[PDB]
Design a protein around this ligand. Structure first.
Ligand code: HEM
Ligand SMILES: [Xe]
Ligand SMILES: [Xe]
Ligand SMILES: [Xe]
Ligand SMILES: [Xe]
Length: 153
């Protein structure tokens, strides 16, 4: 369980992401696909992209990144009271997309890396620890829903 102070560290960096969610999403996807290329294979619409240049130029990838970060932002804004928000996401990611918890760990890593790079003013050590705790909680709760849904993750 995060403290209110921890949630505020999470929300204060998220406020900066929201200056330009699209640009943040592009950086996060590029980082994910570069660091863990296997994750790109899960994307029917994007697995053909060969280079960072192609990734940057993809309007559909940009739009997907906006969807991801906005869905995650809504979850973070619930400050742990995210049962309703997690249900459709867990179901689609377990059953349609088939995304293991390991890959959620990878995207969490990419999120942290991009925030660390872009936002040293709001992503010092305490803020990074708070964001890690929030993402760990997210993954814990997704993992529990995965198991309810019959997916080992
Ligand atoms: C922060 C964690 C993530 C969030 C909040 C998130 C959110 C979303 C949302 C909102 C959608 C569209 C609605 C849906 O189908 O549920 C989506 C689609 C999708 N997600 Fe995720 N996602 C996350 C992580 C991942 C990861 C790590 C992968 C694969 C490695 C993945 C694979 C996909 C795929 C393949 C789609 C369909 C994309 C398309 O329309 O072409 N997701 N995700
Ligand atoms: Xe993203
Ligand atoms: Xe997810
Ligand atoms: Xe995550
Ligand atoms: Xe969360």
């Amino acid at each position: 369980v995060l403290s209110e102070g921890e949630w505020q560290l999470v929300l204060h960096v998220w406020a900066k992401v929201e200056a330009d969610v699209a640009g943040h999403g592009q950086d996060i996807y590029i980082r994910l696909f570069k660091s863990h290329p296997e994750t790109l294979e899960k994307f029917d619409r994007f697995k053909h992209l060969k280079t960072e240049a192609e990734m940057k130029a993809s309007e559909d990838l940009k739009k997907q990144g906006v969807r991801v970060l906005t869905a995650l932002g809504a979850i973070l804004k619930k400050k742990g009271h995210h049962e309703a928000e997690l249900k459709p996401l867990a179901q689609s990611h377990a059953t349609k997309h088939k995304i293991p918890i390991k890959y959620l760990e990878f995207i969490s890593e990419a999120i942290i890396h991009v925030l660390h790079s872009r936002h040293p003013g709001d992503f010092g050590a305490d803020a990074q620890g708070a964001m890690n705790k929030a993402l760990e909680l997210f993954r814990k709760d997704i993992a529990a829903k995965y198991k309810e849904l019959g997916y080992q993750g």
